[PDB]
Design a protein around this ligand. Structure first.
Ligand SMILES: Nc1ncnc2c1ncn2[C@@H]1O[C@H](CN(CCCl)CC[C@H](N)C(=O)O)[C@@H](O)[C@H]1O
Ligand SMILES: Nc1ncnc2c1ncn2[C@@H]1O[C@H](CN(CCCl)CC[C@H](N)C(=O)O)[C@@H](O)[C@H]1O
Ligand SMILES: Nc1ncnc2c1ncn2[C@@H]1O[C@H](CN(CCCl)CC[C@H](N)C(=O)O)[C@@H](O)[C@H]1O
Ligand SMILES: Nc1ncnc2c1ncn2[C@@H]1O[C@H](CSCC[C@H](N)C(=O)O)[C@@H](O)[C@H]1O
Lengths: 353, 330, 332, 353
């Protein structure tokens, strides 16, 4: 259905290029695969969504005997050219098609893949990554092995006001002689259903994070159809909570060492950035209060999730419920350094010049 | 399809409404020609928010049929009710090709122009809607002029060549990508560059291609052939062709023009530039002749072929372009 | 070989080198400050040109100076010696220092044999060959040479050369397809050393050094020169190639004097030299750039250069050929 | 010899590019071949020193049946690659070697070449071009067909002084304590033996040019070993004559039309520019005087000419005799517009602004 558009997007070389040029990502995968050469040398490997084939080449540098590289986009055509020109035709096998519908010659010793999306789960490629375990030997391994999602409440007044400023275009009685007021509410609802793709200063976060772990060795493809993330935040600061901030970490658990790829706002940026879900009604909280609630991710037919966030301040009973659409996020990043919150100065800035 | 979902968002209707030149030229063109709307029947093909039907209602139209296929039709009918015009503006959800109208109309109004005028292939629906048009009916816009002109922009050319050279690395993290160097260059230079530019970079007076919406058939736009013969005013490197367009509202009281030229204030259409993989050298006085051929595709766009040659020297350049994968250089 | 000595046979070239104030004044100061290494001694000037260095030796008190010059500049040199009244101290001997015979062994050899990257022109071999005339505790001015290498980032230069090479990427230059030769064009242009100066900001790691000791080295060492390097990257960026320059030291009895062609120092007719990678290498600060620069002597009195550079963390490798015989003089 | 250094120079693609990028040169050759297609249509052609092969390609565009493209530098290898990739292997035969020492299968109907150097004659490739006539049918044609060398007396005080300024470096009694004066005369002599490659404003010319024609259809290889150019100038202006200026034209005399390629200072610049030979003793002449003399080019073993220029003003008998070496010219061009001589203002500049 919408799979056509998805595989059209990853068929352009310029997109593969954007992902390969993310040094954090490609470098961490290369480090993780080569530093665990005992997990690869002369073993069988499966690259789920090989794209250019970069990960299979990394697997080859580690000494794999044979690597099955599955690719469903037309990038399979270009991928085979790199294997022939890198004289690895005898160890890398390009298979055009989807990992679900293809046939593999044999069970593999280890599976490698880069299936993470915004908030880890977006794009629903982890389901294909776990589906691939039907080709995995009883003692096989998976790179990445586990993925951790993180959540924290945030305060950002300017991000929050921005939505009503954009929507208030509709609240004028004579836009070229037409009254648009009747659509203001609908415009507001639309903008708040967009998760914001951006970075931020860590000082806007108001409580230590909370983590939902997906163990790719134990999880089933069905575990990813309904993801329920409960949270109970102890506020470090007492502000207005305009929503929740999401990021993720993944770990490659190999024989020699475990390697981490992290997209935290404390780490170097990546092409995943961070994702923020705004509350249409911000929640006020004291410091020490508990912000309790649930984040419910419900898979949809269009390769994404419907996000439901219900949060409440237990001491005051103040409740906020929000719905978001992760397939239509708002890309807000600019490149500017992130300005810090006001009221973050505990000593005179003038006496520090 | 993805197309009608995109235009189902209020934020997109807003982005196009906040284009002041576009909206104000449409309103002024309609209002100053209120005689072509007084007590008449109107069809608005793709009304979106309904802004154009409201312009028609302001001009005195007795009844306006507003066809919209995206979910925007629901919101459009909310503005009709809250503006107390429900007896004059009739929203009809669906595609103009599929809906049934109660009667024939005196005039069709629409905003079907895309990049290079032809993008999005909504002109075909604007023309197809003429099956509901009375024998002497009129159309806003009446005609569309596509303008093309050769340009020189060294920075843009090296900008794209730089990105294509990523695929020339013999050892990117130990991997040889050079085998794909050729596909990378094809793909990048197959990107129309959507942006504005200063008129300084044009090396010849523009050439014009006219589409008359009153006389044209939906089939004409399946394959559009634009021949060009440029007379070069300056010497140097021709890195490609630049496209922009004008449309004219030919009404009873006056004709009003809407332009996306680089000398005029900016629109959400900007201008479009097609790059040659290898620029062409030309002197002042030379002639640059060739053909730009647009063949419609199933993905709501066109496959573009540009054949150009310097007649004096025989230097030839052939380029195919994908209007489906633009490069917004904003 | 004939073309080499015709070139240095023109008085205008000798002028171009003599008008290099840093060069000529540093040689005089190094010679005169160490006058005890010259007083009442025998001297050999290898490739005297106009004679300038022999005149510095006579100024320092040398009893007799043998000035060897193989171009026709030897005859002009003889004229300056007569008109400067030094016929009893400076003896011009025409011919190559490899082929002439000298009346006695010398206490010190002086020369100016450095070329681009120090080794260009392959005159250091003749400077070292002349050591057969050197007494057991003799000295040599210059005494040691330090070649310096450092990676650099310079986008405009890289695209400047790529623009030139891309002329051969045309499908119809006057109706003729040249694209079949784009690969040969890029190979040729990027084989060209870029002779120019540059601001030290473009360097991304502290320079690495390769030292030649003229007192100890033998003429054979310079037929194949292997230069290892291991750079610790200080900035994150694209490495577009390596930059080369050199210092030489006059290690005299009284003091050591240094002559430098570094980009932080005033300009010399040697400028600096850069080798471009066809495909730049990406490196982050903290990474290590390791590799080898290899100079293989050839018949045209120059070197075939092979530069292999590698980012140790990422495995990005780059191998480049360079022909010192076809440099690109970019200075204007 | 110098042949080695000569053919090494033309093996670099950057050099061929420099010559191909001279639009005047390459464009005029293309026009001259294509507009005379009757001289090429289904005929046998010989391209002497093809370099990239460009001229052969032009002759193929005009319809020639077979072209023999002779090249002595290693550019011959790259020339064959262009012929294969342009699908012309059945009509263009690249022959590596020197035109004097190679063999052709057959006689040709027409010979094409670009053998002109500074002052037309420099580098001595016209001799190879004329030598190639051993392969020409009794009524064959040659492109170019005739060459015109133009001479004219000029006045340029700043160019003239520039030489003494450069040589007077040697006229100091203490250059780091060394008296250099003895070499001043030798230094002056050296600089004046350099012809100057540059362009100039035609107003520095003091008499109508004189021309010496070589007819390539009739000239013999030995004619070019000793070239005697008598001149007799009628001075249009009174002044100091600092030397003579040289340029050249070639004409392609085809069946349909004659096409001219000119390096005159009145025409668009080319990579040949113009060449000026300075007199060490300038000659004074007033308008109406006659400047008579001879310009004698004596071929030498290093692929160039020794030039002797003797001029005298007949009215005064004032003589000047100068020797120049064409193999060590001074390339003076910059790109600055040539400033016009003083005082060429016959009307007040202030009354014109
Ligand atoms: N069902 C599927 N079967 C096979 N491949 C798929 C499938 N779904 C998505 N992919 C493939 O995975 C590639 C993208 N993917 C990262 C997206 Cl965040 C891996 C890129 C590359 N191998 C890297 O790791 O850097 C894309 O080419 C896509 O087509
Ligand atoms: N094998 C040789 N034997 C004798 N002379 C040689 C030899 N090789 C080169 N030379 C001569 O020494 C001169 C080299 N020259 C600059 C080198 Cl970049 C030094 C000029 C002179 N000492 C100054 O600094 O002013 C040239 O004149 C050359 O002819
Ligand atoms: N005796 C010879 N035999 C064969 N080749 C020769 C001979 N003498 C000179 N050449 C060759 O002709 C080429 C020079 N020629 C320009 C001279 Cl200013 C090339 C122009 C070329 N046809 C263009 O227009 O691009 C050089 O490549 C040279 O190697
Ligand atoms: N065949 C078709 N039938 C009906 N509506 C169509 C259509 N093709 C496109 N549309 C709709 O027409 C609109 C194009 S832009 C609408 C802008 C509006 N006329 C204004 O001036 O503000 C979109 O809402 C699109 O979804």
């Amino acid at each position: 259905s919408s799979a056509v558009q998805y595989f059209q997007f990853y068929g352009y070389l310029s997109q593969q290029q954007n992902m390969m040029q993310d040094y954090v990502r490609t470098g961490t995968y290369q480090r993780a695969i080569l530093q665990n050469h005992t997990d690869f040398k002369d073993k069988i490997v499966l690259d789920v969504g090989c794209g250019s084939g970069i990960l299979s080449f990394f697997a080859a540098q580690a000494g794999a005997r044979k690597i099955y590289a599955v690719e469903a986009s037309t990038m399979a055509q270009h991928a085979e050219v790199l294997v022939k020109s890198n004289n690895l035709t005898d160890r890398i096998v390009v298979i055009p098609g989807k990992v679900e519908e293809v046939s593999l010659p044999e069970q593999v010793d280890i599976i490698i893949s880069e299936p993470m999306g915004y908030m880890l789960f977006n794009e629903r490629m982890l389901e294909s990554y776990l589906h691939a375990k039907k080709y995995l030997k009883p003692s096989g391994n998976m790179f990445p092995t586990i993925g951790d999602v993180h959540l924290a409440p945030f305060t950002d007044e300017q991000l929050y006001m921005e939505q009503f400023t954009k929507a208030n275009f509709w609240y004028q009685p004579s836009f070229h002689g037409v009254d648009l007021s009747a659509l203001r509410g609908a415009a507001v609802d639309e903008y708040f259903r967009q998760p914001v793709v951006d970075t931020f200063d860590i000082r806007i976060l108001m409580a230590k994070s909370v983590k939902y772990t997906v163990n790719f060795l134990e999880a089933k493809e069905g575990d990813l159809h309904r993801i329920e993330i409960p949270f109970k935040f102890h506020m470090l600061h007492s502000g207005l909570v305009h929503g929740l901030a999401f990021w993720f970490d993944v770990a490659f658990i190999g024989s020699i060492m475990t390697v981490w790829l992290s997209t935290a706002p404390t780490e170097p940026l990546t092409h995943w950035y961070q994702v923020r879900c705004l509350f249409q009604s911000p929640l006020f909280a004291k410091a020490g209060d508990t912000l309790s609630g649930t984040c419910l991710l419900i898979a949809n037919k269009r390769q994404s999730y419907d996000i439901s966030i219900v949060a409440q301040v237990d001491q005051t009973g103040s409740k906020s419920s929000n719905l978001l659409d992760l397939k239509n996020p708002f890309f807000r990043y600019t490149g500017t350094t992130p300005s810090p919150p006001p009221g973050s100065h505990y000593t005179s800035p003038s006496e520090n010049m």
